[PDB]
Every structure is written in structure tokens, then in C-alpha cells.
């Protein structure tokens, strides 16, 4: 039923001849293709700026609101170096800081997004007082919601991302590692406890849930949590990596549909969603990181299968967005490219970019927030700009 959710892929798969128009033998984009990306970015930015005039004033979040637009502009500033982009980011940061709701802790859906993005913007504008004030507030946020879930949009790893985002952008340990360590400990303890209570232990030493479901994917589920627990940034011990995380990863691997896709929740029989939030485009990160950490070929094999599912069924009728759209799906190819150095996957990303360059010409659904980072145009623009330098590309607000 995946076919019903996708457009047929109109593109030929990789060969040397077809790839030459997009990038050279070193994987560096051609000037021509680079400029075509740049031209579309400028075109879409105009539409986005106009569209955001109608966006909800109250939503300051990374996922659907102002801080996510600031994330885009910070990225464009880094890519292009145009000071006007940094100024745009400032405007959006200011809007976002007037929208704190005190209800959530995450980068994507909570107050950590505005605060972490603001800290970085202020730093980039040489505003030490405001940068430091934002960091203080961000650190303190780790109190307003204990017994949170563990997942990306509403839970502990979503807060961890905000901390990592500051540290990466300052290039120094602005948030002490000990802060990250203690959250990591809570996550691991939570997983062991739930697995024990539900007698998963033998097959899966860790287990997590959100909204009373065992979500499997990146946004709300196991694949996102395990991707994080396997990151050197989180400093999980070798002992816990092998005894707790690896067998829990293997359990997720075992949930794979015959197609190579993954169910949204444990026990789901319908093979339908090919999204970052649910399915192969989000689970692929766990597989790739598992390969990097454990070096077992099965993980790489599974990642290849993810890429094939996405190549076939990844041009979504849903639209061009990151959370569940063609641009988010294209990032799966970039992560596999960056692991393998196989230009086939850079090519696939470029062809998905070609699709996005025809934005609005396919009869896609209009997103609920048509201009947002995760549902809308800002995310598509983010992807196009990130593709300019493929080796540095990372799925925003998620990939490390
Ligand atoms: C965490 S996002 C989950 C996502 N939700 C949507 O696609 C809803 C539409 C969204 N609000 C938009 O406007 O893009 C989804 O997978 N929906 C289930 C489905 O497509 O059947
Ligand atoms: Zn989604």
C-alpha cells in the first residue's frame, strides 16, 4: 500500500554518465547544478517570507514555528555567508522568545528550541550577555518536566539535542558533559525498567513508549532513542553499549517488513508510511550508526534496503517536507552516501532535489504549516542548501 502514498519515481537510477551533470568524480557538485539549487533557494525564500506573514504568532517551536525558521536562516548564513540571513534569523529568534509556553523541554516542540537557537544566534552576533542568559535558561529547563518521555519530539533526547546544538555551535563545552550524562542515565534506567516490567528483557533489554504505544521510528520511537544512545556525544559506556543498546537495536532490526520498511509501532501489520517520522527514512539513522559502532554487516545490508524502499516509494504525495516528505526522505540517501562514499546515493539525493526544484507542480497536499521547518517549505529549502556541500549535510534538529 506504499505505492498509493507515493508518486512513481520517473528517474533512472545511478550510472556514471547520468551523474556527471550533477557532480564530478570527487563528489563535488557541478557549478551549474549548484547554481540551479541556489536559484531555487532564492525563489522559495521569497515565497516563504510572504507565507510566514500569515503563520500563527503563538507558535515559536522548531517543528512548526518561529525557531525553526531561525534554524533555516542560521544554516543559510553558514552556507552562503550573506549577513542578511543572520539578520533574518535574529528577527525570528526574537519572535520565538516571545512564545515560550513552559510546557515542553525539547528542541523541536518545546522551549529549548527558542533558547538554544537564540544562544547560537546571539553568539554569532557577538552578543555575549544575551547568549549567556539563553544558555542559563536552557540549562534550568531540565526541571520543569521530570518523568518526560524519552523520544525526540517531546522527550529526553529532544532536550539533549538542544544541549548538543549549543556545544557544537560554540565549538566549546558550554553545557557541561555531566548534564548530558545524567539525562542519559535516566534514559537507560527508564528503558531497563520498562523492559523488565513488560518482560521484554530477553529479546530487548531496553523498551520505550510514547502515548501508550511502542513507537519504532525516529520521531517518537526506538530508532531515534537508540541512534542517540549509540552517539559518542552521549558517552554511553562500552559495557552498556553492548549489553543494553546493541540487543535492543537488534530487536528493532527484526521488526523489518518484507519490503525493507519498518512498522510505526510494534505489532502494526500495515506497510504504508515511508517517512522520517515513521518507517525506513527515520530508521536508517539507527542502522547506519549501529554499523559505525558495531561494524556488523547486517546493519549496512539493512541500510541499503532502506535506501531502496525510499528510492521506489519516497516521493510522497504528502509533499516536500522533512518530517514526512520528499526532502526528509532524500536525507536518507545523503547519510548512506556519507557512510559508504558510494556516489549512487549522492545521485539519488540529487534526483530527489530535482523533484523539489519542481515544487508545487505535482499535486501534493498543502501542509498544515506550509512554510515551517518540519512540515513545510523551510525544510525543503534547508535540504536544497545543505546539498550544496554533501559531505557536511545533516538532517536538521536530529542528525549528529
Ligand atoms: C509526526 S508527523 C506524523 C504524520 N502526520 C501527518 O502526516 C499529518 C499531517 C501534517 N500535520 C502536515 O500538515 O504535514 C503521519 O505519519 N501521519 C500518519 C499517516 O500519514 O497516515
Ligand atoms: Zn511526520
Amino acid at each position: 500500500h506504499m505505492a498509493q502514498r507515493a508518486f512513481p519515481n520517473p528517474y533512472a537510477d545511478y550510472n556514471k554518465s547520468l551523474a556527471e551533470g550533477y557532480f564530478d568524480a570527487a563528489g563535488r557538485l557541478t557549478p551549474e547544478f549548484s547554481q540551479r539549487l541556489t536559484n531555487k533557494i532564492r525563489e522559495l525564500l521569497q515565497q516563504m517570507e510572504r507565507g510566514l506573514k500569515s503563520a500563527d504568532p503563538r507558535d515559536g517551536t522548531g517543528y512548526t514555528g518561529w525557531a525553526g525558521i531561525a534554524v533555516l536562516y542560521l544554516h543559510l548564513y553558514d552556507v552562503f555567508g550573506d549577513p542578511a540571513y543572520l539578520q533574518l534569523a535574529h528577527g525570528y529568534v526574537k519572535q520565538s522568545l516571545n512564545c515560550l509556553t513552559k510546557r515542553s523541554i525539547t528542541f523541536l516542540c518545546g522551549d529549548a528550541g527558542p533558547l538554544a537557537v537564540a544562544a547560537v544566534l546571539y553568539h554569532k552576533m557577538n552578543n555575549e550577555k544575551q547568549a549567556e542568559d539563553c544558555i542559563t535558561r536552557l540549562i534550568h529547563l531540565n526541571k520543569i518536566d521530570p518523568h518526560a518521555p524519552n523520544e525526540m519530539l517531546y522527550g529526553r533526547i529532544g532536550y539533549i539535542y538542544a544541549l548538543l546544538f549549543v556545544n557544537k555551535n560554540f565549538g566549546v563545552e558550554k553545557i557541561p558533559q555531566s548534564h548530558i550524562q545524567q539525562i542519559c542515565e535516566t534514559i537507560l534506567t527508564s528503558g531497563e525498567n520498562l523492559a523488565r516490567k513488560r518482560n521484554f528483557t530477553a529479546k530487548s533489554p531496553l523498551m520505550y513508549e510514547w502515548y501508550q504505544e511502542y513507537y519504532v521510528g525516529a520521531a517518537h520511537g526506538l530508532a531515534g532513542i537508540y541512534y542517540y544512545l549509540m552517539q559518542p556525544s552521549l558517552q554511553v559506556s562500552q559495557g552498556k553499549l553492548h549489553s543494553l543498546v546493541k540487543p535492543s537495536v537488534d530487536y528493532v532490526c527484526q521488526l523489518k517488513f518484507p519490503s525493507g520498511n519498518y512498522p510505526p509501532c510494534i505489532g502494526d501489520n500495515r506497510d504504508l508510511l515511508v517517512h522520517w517520522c515513521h518507517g525506513a527514512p527515520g530508521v536508517i539513522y539507527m542502522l547506519i550508526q549501529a554499523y559505525k559502532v558495531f561494524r556488523e554487516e547486517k546493519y549496512l545490508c539493512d541500510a541499503y534496503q532502506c535506501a531502496d524502499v525510499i528510492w521506489q516509494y519516497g516521493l510522497l504525495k504528502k509533499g516536500y517536507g522533512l518530517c514526512h516528505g520528499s526532502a526528509g526522505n532524500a536525507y536518507a540517501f545523503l547519510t548512506l552516501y556519507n557512510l559508504t562514499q558510494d556516489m549512487k546515493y549522492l545521485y539519488r539525493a540529487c534526483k530527489f532535489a530535482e523533484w523539489c526544484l519542481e515544487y508545487g507542480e505535482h499535486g501534493c497536499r498543502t501542509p498544515d504549516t506550509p512554510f515551517s521547518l518540519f512540515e513545510g517549505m523551510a525544510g525543503t529549502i534547508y535540504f536544497l542548501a545543505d546539498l550544496l556541500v554533501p559531505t557536511k549535510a545533516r538532517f536538521p534538529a536530529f542528525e549528529l
Side-chain angles (χ1 to χ4, degrees):
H1 299 291
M2 275 187 293
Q4 296 179 306
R5 284 296 191 96
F7 298 98
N9 185 336
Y11 303 119
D13 207 352
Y14 169 79
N15 71 44
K16 288 228 83 198
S17 302
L18 291 170
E20 272 194 33
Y22 290 102
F23 50 85
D24 62 24
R28 174 230 60 157
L29 293 197
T30 63
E32 201 263 356
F33 183 59
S34 296
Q35 195 59 241
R36 287 206 296 118
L37 289 176
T38 299
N39 288 343
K40 193 68 191 188
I41 289 158
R42 293 177 199 247
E43 183 190 2
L44 290 174
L45 273 175
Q46 282 167 196
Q47 295 181 34
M48 186 197 71
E49 277 298 306
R50 290 182 174 201
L52 283 169
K53 302 308 185 194
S54 293
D56 183 351
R58 303 172 290 168
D59 182 345
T61 69
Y63 189 77
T64 41
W66 302 118
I69 318 302
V71 162
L72 169 64
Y73 276 114
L74 283 178
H75 172 239
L76 292 177
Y77 173 70
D78 282 347
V79 170
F80 288 108
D82 184 350
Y85 292 149
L86 192 65
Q87 193 58 227
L88 260 2
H90 171 275
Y92 289 118
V93 155
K94 274 191 63 195
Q95 285 191 259
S96 81
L97 286 168
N98 275 70
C99 290
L100 304 187
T101 60
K102 311 277 315 110
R103 282 190 304 272
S104 174
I105 65 167
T106 61
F107 188 83
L108 277 166
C109 298
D111 288 354
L115 293 172
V117 174
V120 169
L121 167 93
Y122 282 126
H123 183 241
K124 295 304 205 82
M125 296 192 85
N126 311 281
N127 190 342
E128 183 172 353
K129 167 136 183 62
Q130 294 309 310
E132 292 296 338
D133 286 351
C134 286
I135 294 169
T136 300
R137 292 164 71 191
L138 176 62
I139 293 293
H140 180 78
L141 208 61
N142 195 199
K143 265 212 287 288
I144 68 153
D145 187 18
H147 307 283
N150 292 285
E151 52 63 87
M152 204 73 216
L153 298 202
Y154 295 105
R156 290 173 185 131
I157 64 175
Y159 177 64
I160 286 180
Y161 181 86
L163 306 177
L164 258 20
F165 180 87
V166 169
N167 283 353
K168 192 182 94 77
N169 279 97
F170 280 70
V172 180
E173 193 175 311
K174 276 272 146 186
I175 291 101
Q177 187 65 41
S178 62
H179 205 245
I180 294 152
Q181 174 66 204
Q182 87 109 239
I183 305 161
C184 190
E185 284 289 285
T186 303
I187 294 169
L188 287 164
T189 296
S190 179
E192 286 199 86
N193 289 160
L194 184 64
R196 186 203 76 252
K197 193 181 330 294
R198 303 298 177 195
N199 209 208
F200 269 106
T201 301
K203 288 185 154 76
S204 186
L206 305 169
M207 186 50 54
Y208 300 95
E209 64 194 357
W210 180 72
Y211 221 67
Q212 291 183 146
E213 302 290 355
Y214 303 124
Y215 283 92
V216 169
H220 292 304
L222 298 178
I225 294 162
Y226 300 151
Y227 170 75
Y228 271 65
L229 290 174
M230 282 185 292
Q231 286 295 326
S233 284
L234 271 74
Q235 290 181 12
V236 175
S237 69
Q238 286 302 305
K240 282 173 187 297
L241 204 49
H242 288 275
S243 69
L244 263 26
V245 182
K246 192 185 184 294
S248 301
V249 166
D250 291 339
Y251 180 79
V252 171
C253 290
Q254 164 263 349
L255 300 174
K256 177 189 61 183
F257 284 126
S259 69
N261 197 20
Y262 295 80
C265 296
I266 300 177
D268 287 350
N269 294 133
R270 210 165 213 171
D271 180 9
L272 181 72
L273 305 183
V274 185
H275 302 167
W276 170 83
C277 51
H278 298 118
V283 174
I284 196 173
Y285 297 91
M286 183 199 73
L287 295 171
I288 285 171
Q289 186 64 22
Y291 184 72
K292 289 179 179 163
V293 168
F294 302 118
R295 307 290 316 177
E296 289 184 358
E297 211 90 324
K298 62 186 172 185
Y299 300 126
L300 182 52
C301 176
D302 287 347
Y304 289 142
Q305 188 57 25
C306 283
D308 284 351
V309 169
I310 299 164
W311 182 243
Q312 194 175 347
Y313 296 114
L315 300 170
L316 297 187
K317 291 176 179 184
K318 233 110 156 82
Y320 309 95
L322 291 181
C323 193
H324 41 260
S326 298
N329 290 353
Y331 265 114
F333 302 133
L334 286 178
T335 185
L336 192 54
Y337 165 66
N338 281 132
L339 171 70
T340 59
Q341 297 311 119
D342 184 346
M343 307 264 167
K344 176 175 184 181
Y345 301 109
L346 179 59
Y347 170 90
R348 289 189 179 176
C350 288
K351 296 312 294 191
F352 271 45
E354 204 67 87
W355 183 266
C356 292
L357 257 48
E358 288 186 316
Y359 198 104
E361 296 290 337
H362 308 284
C364 289
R365 201 180 85 90
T366 297
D368 294 351
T369 59
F371 308 101
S372 67
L373 188 68
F374 266 64
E375 296 189 337
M377 194 179 282
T380 310
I381 298 167
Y382 194 109
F383 161 69
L384 296 177
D386 217 9
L387 180 60
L388 255 11
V389 182
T391 54
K392 288 179 88 186
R394 296 295 184 275
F395 192 112
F398 177 72
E399 185 169 21
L400 299 182

